[PDB]
Paper text:
To access this source of nutrients, gut bacteria encode α-l-fucosidases (fucosidases) which catalyze the hydrolysis of terminal α-l-fucosidic linkages. We identified and characterized a fucosidase from R. gnavus E1 with the capacity to recognize fucosylated glycans capped with sialic acid and to hydrolyze α1–3/4 fucosyl linkages in these substrates without the need to remove sialic acid. The enzymatic characterization of R. gnavus fucosidases focused on previously uncharacterized bacterial fucosidases revealed that fucosidase ATCC_03833 belongs to GH29-A while E1_10125 belongs to GH29-B subfamily. The enzyme consists of two distinct domains, a catalytic domain (PF001120) domain comprising residues 46–366 in N-terminal and a F5/8 Type C domain (PF00754) covering residues 385–526 in C-terminal.
To further investigate E1_10125 ligand specificity, the enzyme was crystallized in the presence of 2′FL, providing the crystal structure of the complex showing the β-fucose anomer bound in the active site. Electron density maps allowed modelling of residues 23–527. The catalytic machinery sits in a cleft in the center of the N-terminal domain. By proximity to the bound fucose residue and homology to other fucosidases, Asp221 was identified as the catalytic nucleophile and Glu273 as the acid/base (amino acid numbering based on recombinant protein sequence). Trp325 creates a CH–π interaction with the bound ligand and His61, Trp72, His114, His115 and Tyr162 provides additional hydrogen bonding interactions. Phe59 and Trp219 provide a hydrophobic pocket to accommodate the fucose C6 methyl group. The fucose binding site is conserved with the S. pneumoniae and B. longum GH29 fucosidases and is henceforth referred to as the − 1 subsite. In the E1_10125 crystal structure, adjacent to the proposed + 2 site is an open platform comprises primarily neutral and hydrophobic residues, which would accommodate Neu5Ac. This is in marked contrast to the S. pneumoniae and B. longum homologue structures where this region is partially occluded by incoming loops. The ability to accommodate the sialic acid moiety, as also confirmed by STD NMR, appears to be enabled by an open region adjacent to the + 2 site (Gal residue in Le antigens), which  comprises residues Met220, Phe259, Gly260, Ala261 and Thr265 with additional stabilizing interactions likely to be provided by Trp269 and Glu262.
Author numbering: 23 to 527
The structure:
């Protein structure tokens, strides 16, 4: 007995929200799906991934950019391809700062680089382009610093000593740089960053250094969080118990099949457990802290551009990433590295554009909305307009279908209106109110009766589940979603699609 949108005159209160829900930044990020990384600095000019061997070489010797950095082209290409954020490596492990910093001489200002206006600040250049195009930004600022004298415990002359005798505190230097960037209107999207990357990767032989994470976080939020007047705190990557965007746990762009946007944290001990399973952090159904699962990956073989590492991944490789990250309730943070001329190689740009074009065309035509198609459900919450099945195909994340209290599971019938070719089924849970769905099943058949053929079954939906299969023909698709006793499922959007040739499995 399938229920449509007609004659729903009932009423009901909204389903209770989960205890653990995303803040406004986390929610926005999960719905954006696509973010870009930009690795650029001395490594770009020295055919290396970790700049461990620069020694006492001057900025002019290691950062040799002549041409005006082309921020415009990069940002425009990324925006056109559907990327909604750019995370910039302001400082990598080598310590070289690509903004004009008063707190070090190891920066772009000291290098000799100057744009058309004689200014020397790559971060400012990227920020201007992001602001012009309304591209949000993240800030990567390496905690491990190979160059900065204050890193580690040293006396006035540079001899190693105990923490109590340390003459210059690295925590103050790092904090000052956060304040310098975050506090200045010329950095960020109209002064704003939504994410700070403080990844803890560190050379096995590097000196000990304790980080004053609490001090750093306050500085971040005083400039970019609620304390600064924003609607959410700035998201933090690599911040232990204060993490709000977690590492997916590999660099392949692959999230586990059943990925939860929640971790277990202990703010007393400053620990975090995000449930490592195989090569991915799959999170916890009963996690106490929302963490956005962020799958970082390289479009080329390295993070930095180089003459041996400038071949972009194929559409097959990139489509695999997309379906296994975005399709598994994770974001995809794809690195697109500038070259030693300060632009991006044509082949790389073109692959980015191609990837974007393929995503757009794959999801252009929602077959559940075709003429003669219909979406119905096994039950509507209170028989009320507010939870009608049409809420799953209105391109509105704020509207959802749900069942009545006491019904923890429901079915969705998509009738395509005729025998129809497809290979992608898309399901989106209303995660603004929590991630709670713990079983799903997608089935199909020819005609309007007879046994169902299983496409895919699993646990989670979250921000987005994409079920990709080989080209299939069917008339009806049935989706089953359920949660635990005393809760009801909420689905904000569904769709059925045939992918482009270069996105097919
Ligand atoms: C995105 C990756 O973050 C890590 O901290 C670094 O060790 C890698 O070089 C790369 O920048
Ligand atoms: Ca020190
Ligand atoms: Ca909706
Ligand atoms: Mg969307
Ligand atoms: Mg420029
Ligand atoms: Mg300086
Ligand atoms: Mg700011």
């Amino acid at each position: 007995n399938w229920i449509g949108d007609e004659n729903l005159t009932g009423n009901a209160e909204a389903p209770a929200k989960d205890d653990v829900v995303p803040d406004k930044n986390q929610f926005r990020y999960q719905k954006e799906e696509l973010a870009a990384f930009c690795h650029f600095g001395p490594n770009t000019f020295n055919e290396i991934e970790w700049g461990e061997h620069y020694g006492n070489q001057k900025p002019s010797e290691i950062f040799t950019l002549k041409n005006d950095f082309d921020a415009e082209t990069l940002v425009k290409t990324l925006k056109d391809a559907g990327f909604k954020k750019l995370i910039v490596t302001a400082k990598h492990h080598d310590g070289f700062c690509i903004w004009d910093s008063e707190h070090t001489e190891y920066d772009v200002k000291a290098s000799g680089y100057k744009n058309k206006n004689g200014e020397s600040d790559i971060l400012a250049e990227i920020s201007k382009a992001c602001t012009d195009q309304n591209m949000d930004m993240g800030l990567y600022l390496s905690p491990w610093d190979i160059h900065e004298p204050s890193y580690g415990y040293k006396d006035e002359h540079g001899n190693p000593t105990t923490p109590d005798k340390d003459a210059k505190d690295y925590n103050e230097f790092y904090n000052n740089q956060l304040e310098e960037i975050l506090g200045n209107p010329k950095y960020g999207n109209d002064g704003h960053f939504v994410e700070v990357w403080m990844d803890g990767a560190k050379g096995s032989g590097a000196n000990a250094q304790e980080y004053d994470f609490k001090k750093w976080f306050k500085t971040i939020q005083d400039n970019e969080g609620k304390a600064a007047g924003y609607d959410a705190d700035c998201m933090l990557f690599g911040a232990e118990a204060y993490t709000t965007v977690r590492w997916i746990g590999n660099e392949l762009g692959i999230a586990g099949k059943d990925t939860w946007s929640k971790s277990k944290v202990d703010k007393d001990k400053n620990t975090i457990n995000s449930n490592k399973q195989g090569n991915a952090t799959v999170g916890f159904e009963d996690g106490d802290q929302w963490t956005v699962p962020e799958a970082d990956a390289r479009i080329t073989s390295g993070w930095f551009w180089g003459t041996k590492k400038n071949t972009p991944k194929t559409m097959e490789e990139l489509s695999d990433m997309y379906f296994n990250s975005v399709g598994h309730n994770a974001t995809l943070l794809l690195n697109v590295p500038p070259n030693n001329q300060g632009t991006v190689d044509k082949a790389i740009l073109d692959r980015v554009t191609e990837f974007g074009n393929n995503i757009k065309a794959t999801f252009k035509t929602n077959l559940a909305k075709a003429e003669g198609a219909s979406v119905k459900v096994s039950e509507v919450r209170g028989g009320a307009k507010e939870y009608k099945p049409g809420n799953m195909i209105d391109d509105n994340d704020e509207t959802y279908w749900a069942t009545s209290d006491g019904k923890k599971s429901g079915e969705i019938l998509i009738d395509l209106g005729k025998e129809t070719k497809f290979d992608v089924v898309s399901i989106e849970e209303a995660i603004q109110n929590g991630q709670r769905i713990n079983n799903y099943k997608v089935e199909y058949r020819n005609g309007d009766s007879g046994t169902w053929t299983l496409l895919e079954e699993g646990k989670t939906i979250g921000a987005k589940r994409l079920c990709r299969t080989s080209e299939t023909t069917a008339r009806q698709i049935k989706i089953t979603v359920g949660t635990c006793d005393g809760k009801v499922p909420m689905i904000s959007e569904i769709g059925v699609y045939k992918s482009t040739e270069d996105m097919e499995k």
